[PDB]
Amino acid sequence: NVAQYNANHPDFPMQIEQLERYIQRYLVYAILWSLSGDSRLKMRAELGEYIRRITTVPLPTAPNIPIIDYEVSISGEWSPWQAKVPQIEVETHKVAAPDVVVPTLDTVRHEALLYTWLAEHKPLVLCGPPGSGKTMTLFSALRALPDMEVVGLNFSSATTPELLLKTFDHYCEYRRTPNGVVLAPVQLGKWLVLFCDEINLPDMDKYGTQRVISFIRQMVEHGGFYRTSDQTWVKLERIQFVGACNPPTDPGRKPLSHRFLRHVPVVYVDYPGPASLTQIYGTFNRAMLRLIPSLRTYAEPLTAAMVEFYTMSQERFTQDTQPHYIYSPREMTRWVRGIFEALRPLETLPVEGLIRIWAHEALRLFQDRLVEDEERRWTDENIDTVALKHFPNIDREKAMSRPILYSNWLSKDYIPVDQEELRDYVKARLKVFYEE
Amino acid sequence: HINSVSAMKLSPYYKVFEEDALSWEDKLNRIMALFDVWIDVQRRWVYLEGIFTGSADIKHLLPVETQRFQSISTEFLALMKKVSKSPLVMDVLNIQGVQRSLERLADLLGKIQKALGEYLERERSSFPRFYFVGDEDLLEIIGNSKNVAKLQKHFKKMFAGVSSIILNEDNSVVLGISSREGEEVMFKTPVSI
Amino acid sequence: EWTDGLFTHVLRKIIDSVRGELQKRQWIVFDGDVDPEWVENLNSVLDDNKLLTLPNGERLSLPPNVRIMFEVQDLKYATLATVSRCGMVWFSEDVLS
Amino acid sequence: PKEWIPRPPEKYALSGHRSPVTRVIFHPVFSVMVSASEDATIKVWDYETGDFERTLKGHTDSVQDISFDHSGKLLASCSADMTIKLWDFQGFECIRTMHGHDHNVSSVAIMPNGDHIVSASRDKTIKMWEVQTGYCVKTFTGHREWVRMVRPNQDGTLIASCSNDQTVRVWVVATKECKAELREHEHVVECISWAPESSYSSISEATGSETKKSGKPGPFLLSGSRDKTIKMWDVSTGMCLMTLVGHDNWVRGVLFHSGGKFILSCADDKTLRVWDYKNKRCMKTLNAHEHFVTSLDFHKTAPYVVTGSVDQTVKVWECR
Amino acid sequence: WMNGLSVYQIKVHRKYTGEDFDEDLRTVLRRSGCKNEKIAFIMDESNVL
Ligand SMILES: Nc1ncnc2c1ncn2[C@@H]1O[C@H](COP(=O)(O)OP(=O)(O)O)[C@@H](O)[C@H]1O
């Protein structure tokens, strides 16, 4: 970064006192992130306050907010991360697109840390609960590097190095050099990034080892791997690895070996929490409720309702009851996308209709997964009471009903459908379908 | 140069300069092949560009053909801009992928030239004497309509004793009719091209 | 659509002269037997017209530097319309010793 | 004139059938019409009076399409019993039963020349028949799925087809095949129809097109959408000139007006739609039946539109 | 059938090795990507061997 400043300012070089004041602050920042990047907010705040209380380095005059909230600017002074990104107004067209990322404190902070670790072509591992945002963060921090090309890889229980070998056979080529055999991507001048998505899940042996993890550790440390066809050492030229993984205390995951974990920095991405979630999806809701200008004022209560019901359901149904009871911001993103898809062709809808769409999407996201009738009844009752809590003086009977169904079969758009009419239509379509 | 290299290859002290001779011969053969393809593809593209720019209302009858040739013409424009920015013979010889790119361009332009029979028949219906001209020659005549440089080698097919025509310095007014033995007739009044 | 043959392709190449075949002395030699199946196609070329006519209506005037040659063994199947159009050089069996 | 449109309510609600009505067509010269249903019968109705005239038994399974010739003296019917029958409409008796298909024959028509019959069946083949002898002379292949309908053009030189193959395929009858393959429908293609001669000017000035300058403006197809759309095509490899979105369910039948100024359409939404295709919108909506509407036809001279439906009723609409 | 997808079932039997599943997957991928054919790939738990 100092060399970049020197190249960008040829007439004014990098002064010594500015270099000192920049490098001391960057040392404090890098110690903080390197030593508490894989811990919770409370623990990184504890490490920050310990460093502030023991070590005499100039620090920001922050009474409450932690030191990790700050950024060491290139001019040599602390700058807050929150002032970097303001409120953004995403367009109505891409309201829940797979590539849109509304900036947040944790998002920008993790993107900067990822860029720092990825510029040196160092392997890393992204850890956190499922759906926390450990692929959007990598892809957003890696879209700023045109040199990098992602290759997706999904590890399983029965993953063996032949997955990596098949990926290398597809995306790279083997060439013979006087120094030996090297392996490089076919795209000249480009770096290949292998994104292993479930890096714990390769099945641990009877003797506490994983073949894939040992293979990746050998490639990361020794710089290459033996080719089992001719027993010839094969070097890598432009290849790095990035891992994503759930925490090792999850039911299917196993702890990585210390020899592998020596090389890969680990950063812990957590669920955004309520205060971040309300903004991070109220932006989407405000963008979405521009198709219908009469529903513009029903954005903050709608976002609060989605956040509150998602929090309630996540607290109620957990991993210990059933293996599939995982609720993440993926559910909120699909919620926003479903409401947007049901609102796009209409362009005229009352608040009762909006609440009906919201409740139908809530059902289809949080009730189709469940197993027990008690859980299904709990979700129905709590959808009703959350909607009544966040939307007073509304037509409860006109916005809620026992069937509550939506379809585009009897209508060109995606509008609610009467159960009897749907049954008659399905009977006629089955009459056609028997003969076809 | 190739003849001289082959002559000194045989006799008498070629053994000491052998590797240099092979390198020279290989680069000469490579530039010969590249420019042998290049002359044909440029000769095709000049009249294809002429017919697809000077003549209008072709997109309303062959939309996919016009779009395909527009993309191929933009690609050829970019490649020739690169060649213009690198006017060295060694540089154009060692441009990465030049041989396969030019081969593919020749194949695509050949396909575009092949898929023009109905339009050529319409043009032949438009001018009666074009019925005695082949498809490729008619394509060259239509594409080089503004040039009036390659019509002298095609007028003898259309007409009886009109081997060529005489023109002014501006090459935009016909002055008379020329035969193949030098006998010429002067027009009473010229034609406003 | 017309697909050229060997003789038509060679003659069209010489007529086009993309690489300059017109300046050189070009000779077309037919090294085979002569029958009215394919030589009555060439009788217009060997005629005073110096012209080759195709079913398209495309005509290829023979350039002055090109000589149409035949290396034949006998003419027991050629007709008068073929023999009368060409100059004979009778290479007797005693020419080669 | 060239402007009459069907208006509610219907003139007569003829309800003599026993099973869903499949196809309904008019007569070329007489004031009568026929209708095909799924009970293996072809009832003949006087639409001017509104009384059932006579029936035509003979088919073993559900008859799926019917078509008159230019003279009006022949009726060609195809059924799900894999046979095609030619009816002498002067004496109302079957002339010949013409086997040859391997599955349910879906549609037939009589070419404007008058001595050839087209077909379309679930074995993905289209066959040409001889009216005089009954032999098969030409079979068309290329469709990958069930072919649903076949319609020769105005002069009999071109044949269009629609299929479960998701495509519309049009070809010349005589020697060449697959003139165009049209692939802009995202679901099954159901009902095609050509454009009449007195529609080319309105089509040219309605869609994006220059002031002709090419000659022979080219034939125009129509729709065939199980994805609730309407699509008209062009000459050569074919482009979609317009798409008339605004429909509600699976489109089952499409037509032009007699004057060529309108598009008539019926579908499973129990609705007959009148499209003002010059502005790409439906300017009139008719709640036709109490169930799915399977077919419609438009009279060339008289002001009458007739629709058949799964309601086992055939309704005739007078135009004002 | 209502949505226009083409149903594909692998039709498993005995001695159904991994090469046969690879071939079925190849045919499904070819039809779905090369020929723009919407396919509903229905697979059972008993089909996993
Ligand atoms: N700004 C945002 N912050 C947090 N989550 C988001 C945001 N935008 C979208 N999401 C959702 O969060 C989910 C994170 O999933 P992904 O990126 O695959 O990470 P993981 O691998 O942890 O699931 C995405 O599916 C996306 O729908």
mmCIF file with all atom_site columns, N, CA, C and O in Angstrom, chain A residues 408-413 424-425 428-429 431-432 435-436, chain D residues 122 146 148 226 228 246-250 268 291-292 310:
data_model
loop_
_atom_site.group_PDB
_atom_site.id
_atom_site.type_symbol
_atom_site.label_atom_id
_atom_site.label_alt_id
_atom_site.label_comp_id
_atom_site.label_asym_id
_atom_site.label_entity_id
_atom_site.label_seq_id
_atom_site.pdbx_PDB_ins_code
_atom_site.Cartn_x
_atom_site.Cartn_y
_atom_site.Cartn_z
_atom_site.occupancy
_atom_site.B_iso_or_equiv
_atom_site.pdbx_formal_charge
_atom_site.auth_seq_id
_atom_site.auth_comp_id
_atom_site.auth_asym_id
_atom_site.auth_atom_id
_atom_site.pdbx_PDB_model_num
ATOM 1   N N  . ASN A 1 408 ? -50.667 -18.994 -10.938 1.00 0.00 ? 408 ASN A N  1
ATOM 2   C CA . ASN A 1 408 ? -50.730 -18.364 -12.249 1.00 0.00 ? 408 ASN A CA 1
ATOM 3   C C  . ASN A 1 408 ? -51.331 -19.293 -13.296 1.00 0.00 ? 408 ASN A C  1
ATOM 4   O O  . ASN A 1 408 ? -51.091 -19.119 -14.493 1.00 0.00 ? 408 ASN A O  1
ATOM 5   N N  . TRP A 1 409 ? -52.104 -20.289 -12.864 1.00 0.00 ? 409 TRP A N  1
ATOM 6   C CA . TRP A 1 409 ? -52.747 -21.194 -13.805 1.00 0.00 ? 409 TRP A CA 1
ATOM 7   C C  . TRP A 1 409 ? -54.056 -20.610 -14.313 1.00 0.00 ? 409 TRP A C  1
ATOM 8   O O  . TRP A 1 409 ? -54.257 -20.475 -15.523 1.00 0.00 ? 409 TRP A O  1
ATOM 9   N N  . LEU A 1 410 ? -54.955 -20.252 -13.403 1.00 0.00 ? 410 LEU A N  1
ATOM 10  C CA . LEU A 1 410 ? -56.237 -19.677 -13.780 1.00 0.00 ? 410 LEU A CA 1
ATOM 11  C C  . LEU A 1 410 ? -56.134 -18.218 -14.185 1.00 0.00 ? 410 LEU A C  1
ATOM 12  O O  . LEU A 1 410 ? -57.103 -17.673 -14.723 1.00 0.00 ? 410 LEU A O  1
ATOM 13  N N  . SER A 1 411 ? -54.999 -17.572 -13.938 1.00 0.00 ? 411 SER A N  1
ATOM 14  C CA . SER A 1 411 ? -54.820 -16.173 -14.284 1.00 0.00 ? 411 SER A CA 1
ATOM 15  C C  . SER A 1 411 ? -53.461 -15.991 -14.939 1.00 0.00 ? 411 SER A C  1
ATOM 16  O O  . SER A 1 411 ? -52.532 -16.764 -14.711 1.00 0.00 ? 411 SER A O  1
ATOM 17  N N  . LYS A 1 412 ? -53.362 -14.955 -15.770 1.00 0.00 ? 412 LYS A N  1
ATOM 18  C CA . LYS A 1 412 ? -52.116 -14.692 -16.480 1.00 0.00 ? 412 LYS A CA 1
ATOM 19  C C  . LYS A 1 412 ? -51.009 -14.273 -15.519 1.00 0.00 ? 412 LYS A C  1
ATOM 20  O O  . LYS A 1 412 ? -49.853 -14.682 -15.678 1.00 0.00 ? 412 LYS A O  1
ATOM 21  N N  . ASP A 1 413 ? -51.346 -13.474 -14.511 1.00 0.00 ? 413 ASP A N  1
ATOM 22  C CA . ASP A 1 413 ? -50.388 -13.021 -13.517 1.00 0.00 ? 413 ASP A CA 1
ATOM 23  C C  . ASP A 1 413 ? -50.354 -14.006 -12.351 1.00 0.00 ? 413 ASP A C  1
ATOM 24  O O  . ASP A 1 413 ? -50.968 -15.074 -12.394 1.00 0.00 ? 413 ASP A O  1
ATOM 25  N N  . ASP A 1 424 ? -61.519 -27.472 -9.669  1.00 0.00 ? 424 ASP A N  1
ATOM 26  C CA . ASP A 1 424 ? -62.171 -27.747 -10.947 1.00 0.00 ? 424 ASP A CA 1
ATOM 27  C C  . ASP A 1 424 ? -61.174 -27.700 -12.099 1.00 0.00 ? 424 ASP A C  1
ATOM 28  O O  . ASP A 1 424 ? -61.197 -28.560 -12.993 1.00 0.00 ? 424 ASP A O  1
ATOM 29  N N  . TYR A 1 425 ? -60.283 -26.705 -12.090 1.00 0.00 ? 425 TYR A N  1
ATOM 30  C CA . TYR A 1 425 ? -59.286 -26.600 -13.146 1.00 0.00 ? 425 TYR A CA 1
ATOM 31  C C  . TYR A 1 425 ? -58.332 -27.785 -13.130 1.00 0.00 ? 425 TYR A C  1
ATOM 32  O O  . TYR A 1 425 ? -57.955 -28.295 -14.188 1.00 0.00 ? 425 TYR A O  1
ATOM 33  N N  . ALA A 1 428 ? -60.100 -30.803 -14.651 1.00 0.00 ? 428 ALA A N  1
ATOM 34  C CA . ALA A 1 428 ? -60.125 -30.755 -16.112 1.00 0.00 ? 428 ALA A CA 1
ATOM 35  C C  . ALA A 1 428 ? -58.742 -31.012 -16.709 1.00 0.00 ? 428 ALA A C  1
ATOM 36  O O  . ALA A 1 428 ? -58.605 -31.746 -17.700 1.00 0.00 ? 428 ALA A O  1
ATOM 37  N N  . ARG A 1 429 ? -57.704 -30.423 -16.114 1.00 0.00 ? 429 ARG A N  1
ATOM 38  C CA . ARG A 1 429 ? -56.347 -30.649 -16.594 1.00 0.00 ? 429 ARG A CA 1
ATOM 39  C C  . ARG A 1 429 ? -55.923 -32.095 -16.409 1.00 0.00 ? 429 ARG A C  1
ATOM 40  O O  . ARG A 1 429 ? -55.175 -32.624 -17.228 1.00 0.00 ? 429 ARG A O  1
ATOM 41  N N  . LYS A 1 431 ? -58.073 -34.576 -16.602 1.00 0.00 ? 431 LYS A N  1
ATOM 42  C CA . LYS A 1 431 ? -58.780 -35.248 -17.688 1.00 0.00 ? 431 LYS A CA 1
ATOM 43  C C  . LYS A 1 431 ? -57.979 -35.178 -18.980 1.00 0.00 ? 431 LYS A C  1
ATOM 44  O O  . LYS A 1 431 ? -57.902 -36.160 -19.726 1.00 0.00 ? 431 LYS A O  1
ATOM 45  N N  . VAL A 1 432 ? -57.373 -34.024 -19.258 1.00 0.00 ? 432 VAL A N  1
ATOM 46  C CA . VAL A 1 432 ? -56.496 -33.917 -20.424 1.00 0.00 ? 432 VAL A CA 1
ATOM 47  C C  . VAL A 1 432 ? -55.225 -34.741 -20.226 1.00 0.00 ? 432 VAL A C  1
ATOM 48  O O  . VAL A 1 432 ? -54.728 -35.382 -21.158 1.00 0.00 ? 432 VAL A O  1
ATOM 49  N N  . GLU A 1 435 ? -54.905 -38.745 -20.929 1.00 0.00 ? 435 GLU A N  1
ATOM 50  C CA . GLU A 1 435 ? -54.767 -39.204 -22.304 1.00 0.00 ? 435 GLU A CA 1
ATOM 51  C C  . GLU A 1 435 ? -53.430 -38.838 -22.930 1.00 0.00 ? 435 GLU A C  1
ATOM 52  O O  . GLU A 1 435 ? -53.111 -39.357 -24.004 1.00 0.00 ? 435 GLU A O  1
ATOM 53  N N  . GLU A 1 436 ? -52.641 -37.975 -22.296 1.00 0.00 ? 436 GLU A N  1
ATOM 54  C CA . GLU A 1 436 ? -51.399 -37.502 -22.893 1.00 0.00 ? 436 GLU A CA 1
ATOM 55  C C  . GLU A 1 436 ? -50.155 -38.148 -22.304 1.00 0.00 ? 436 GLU A C  1
ATOM 56  O O  . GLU A 1 436 ? -49.227 -38.468 -23.051 1.00 0.00 ? 436 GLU A O  1
ATOM 57  N N  . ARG D 2 122 ? -49.755 -38.485 -33.449 1.00 0.00 ? 122 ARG D N  1
ATOM 58  C CA . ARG D 2 122 ? -48.833 -38.535 -32.324 1.00 0.00 ? 122 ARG D CA 1
ATOM 59  C C  . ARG D 2 122 ? -47.517 -39.221 -32.652 1.00 0.00 ? 122 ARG D C  1
ATOM 60  O O  . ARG D 2 122 ? -46.590 -39.146 -31.839 1.00 0.00 ? 122 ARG D O  1
ATOM 61  N N  . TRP D 2 146 ? -45.433 -35.173 -30.679 1.00 0.00 ? 146 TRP D N  1
ATOM 62  C CA . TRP D 2 146 ? -46.792 -35.210 -31.205 1.00 0.00 ? 146 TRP D CA 1
ATOM 63  C C  . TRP D 2 146 ? -47.102 -33.952 -32.006 1.00 0.00 ? 146 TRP D C  1
ATOM 64  O O  . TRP D 2 146 ? -46.979 -32.837 -31.500 1.00 0.00 ? 146 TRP D O  1
ATOM 65  N N  . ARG D 2 148 ? -49.767 -31.572 -33.596 1.00 0.00 ? 148 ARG D N  1
ATOM 66  C CA . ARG D 2 148 ? -51.125 -31.297 -33.158 1.00 0.00 ? 148 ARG D CA 1
ATOM 67  C C  . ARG D 2 148 ? -52.042 -30.785 -34.256 1.00 0.00 ? 148 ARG D C  1
ATOM 68  O O  . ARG D 2 148 ? -53.255 -31.000 -34.166 1.00 0.00 ? 148 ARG D O  1
ATOM 69  N N  . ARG D 2 226 ? -49.489 -22.797 -25.996 1.00 0.00 ? 226 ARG D N  1
ATOM 70  C CA . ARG D 2 226 ? -50.021 -23.274 -24.740 1.00 0.00 ? 226 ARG D CA 1
ATOM 71  C C  . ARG D 2 226 ? -49.470 -22.437 -23.586 1.00 0.00 ? 226 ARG D C  1
ATOM 72  O O  . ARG D 2 226 ? -49.808 -22.673 -22.423 1.00 0.00 ? 226 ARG D O  1
ATOM 73  N N  . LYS D 2 228 ? -50.183 -19.196 -23.364 1.00 0.00 ? 228 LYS D N  1
ATOM 74  C CA . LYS D 2 228 ? -51.115 -18.060 -23.278 1.00 0.00 ? 228 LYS D CA 1
ATOM 75  C C  . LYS D 2 228 ? -50.639 -16.831 -24.053 1.00 0.00 ? 228 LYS D C  1
ATOM 76  O O  . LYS D 2 228 ? -50.743 -15.701 -23.572 1.00 0.00 ? 228 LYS D O  1
ATOM 77  N N  . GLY D 2 246 ? -51.687 -10.985 -23.272 1.00 0.00 ? 246 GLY D N  1
ATOM 78  C CA . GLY D 2 246 ? -52.944 -10.466 -22.784 1.00 0.00 ? 246 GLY D CA 1
ATOM 79  C C  . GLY D 2 246 ? -53.969 -11.568 -22.667 1.00 0.00 ? 246 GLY D C  1
ATOM 80  O O  . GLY D 2 246 ? -55.130 -11.322 -22.329 1.00 0.00 ? 246 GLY D O  1
ATOM 81  N N  . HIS D 2 247 ? -53.544 -12.795 -22.935 1.00 0.00 ? 247 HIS D N  1
ATOM 82  C CA . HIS D 2 247 ? -54.433 -13.937 -22.830 1.00 0.00 ? 247 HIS D CA 1
ATOM 83  C C  . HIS D 2 247 ? -54.250 -14.597 -21.472 1.00 0.00 ? 247 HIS D C  1
ATOM 84  O O  . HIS D 2 247 ? -53.316 -14.298 -20.728 1.00 0.00 ? 247 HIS D O  1
ATOM 85  N N  . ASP D 2 248 ? -55.149 -15.518 -21.161 1.00 0.00 ? 248 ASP D N  1
ATOM 86  C CA . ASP D 2 248 ? -55.338 -15.955 -19.788 1.00 0.00 ? 248 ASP D CA 1
ATOM 87  C C  . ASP D 2 248 ? -55.018 -17.428 -19.560 1.00 0.00 ? 248 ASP D C  1
ATOM 88  O O  . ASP D 2 248 ? -54.535 -17.777 -18.484 1.00 0.00 ? 248 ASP D O  1
ATOM 89  N N  . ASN D 2 249 ? -55.235 -18.295 -20.539 1.00 0.00 ? 249 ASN D N  1
ATOM 90  C CA . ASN D 2 249 ? -54.947 -19.714 -20.366 1.00 0.00 ? 249 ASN D CA 1
ATOM 91  C C  . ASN D 2 249 ? -54.499 -20.281 -21.709 1.00 0.00 ? 249 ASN D C  1
ATOM 92  O O  . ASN D 2 249 ? -54.149 -19.544 -22.636 1.00 0.00 ? 249 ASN D O  1
ATOM 93  N N  . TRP D 2 250 ? -54.510 -21.606 -21.810 1.00 0.00 ? 250 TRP D N  1
ATOM 94  C CA . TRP D 2 250 ? -53.975 -22.311 -22.968 1.00 0.00 ? 250 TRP D CA 1
ATOM 95  C C  . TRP D 2 250 ? -54.780 -21.991 -24.218 1.00 0.00 ? 250 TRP D C  1
ATOM 96  O O  . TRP D 2 250 ? -55.951 -22.362 -24.317 1.00 0.00 ? 250 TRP D O  1
ATOM 97  N N  . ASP D 2 268 ? -58.829 -21.959 -23.098 1.00 0.00 ? 268 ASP D N  1
ATOM 98  C CA . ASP D 2 268 ? -59.312 -22.642 -21.907 1.00 0.00 ? 268 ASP D CA 1
ATOM 99  C C  . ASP D 2 268 ? -59.749 -21.687 -20.812 1.00 0.00 ? 268 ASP D C  1
ATOM 100 O O  . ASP D 2 268 ? -60.248 -22.144 -19.780 1.00 0.00 ? 268 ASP D O  1
ATOM 101 N N  . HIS D 2 291 ? -67.065 -23.890 -19.751 1.00 0.00 ? 291 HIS D N  1
ATOM 102 C CA . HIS D 2 291 ? -65.887 -24.735 -19.618 1.00 0.00 ? 291 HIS D CA 1
ATOM 103 C C  . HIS D 2 291 ? -64.882 -24.313 -20.682 1.00 0.00 ? 291 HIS D C  1
ATOM 104 O O  . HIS D 2 291 ? -64.998 -23.238 -21.276 1.00 0.00 ? 291 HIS D O  1
ATOM 105 N N  . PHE D 2 292 ? -63.887 -25.164 -20.922 1.00 0.00 ? 292 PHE D N  1
ATOM 106 C CA . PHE D 2 292 ? -62.820 -24.828 -21.856 1.00 0.00 ? 292 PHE D CA 1
ATOM 107 C C  . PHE D 2 292 ? -63.369 -24.726 -23.270 1.00 0.00 ? 292 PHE D C  1
ATOM 108 O O  . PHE D 2 292 ? -64.147 -25.573 -23.709 1.00 0.00 ? 292 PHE D O  1
ATOM 109 N N  . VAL D 2 310 ? -65.714 -27.826 -24.349 1.00 0.00 ? 310 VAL D N  1
ATOM 110 C CA . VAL D 2 310 ? -65.834 -29.021 -23.519 1.00 0.00 ? 310 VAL D CA 1
ATOM 111 C C  . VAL D 2 310 ? -67.176 -29.084 -22.802 1.00 0.00 ? 310 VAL D C  1
ATOM 112 O O  . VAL D 2 310 ? -67.537 -30.128 -22.248 1.00 0.00 ? 310 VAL D O  1
#
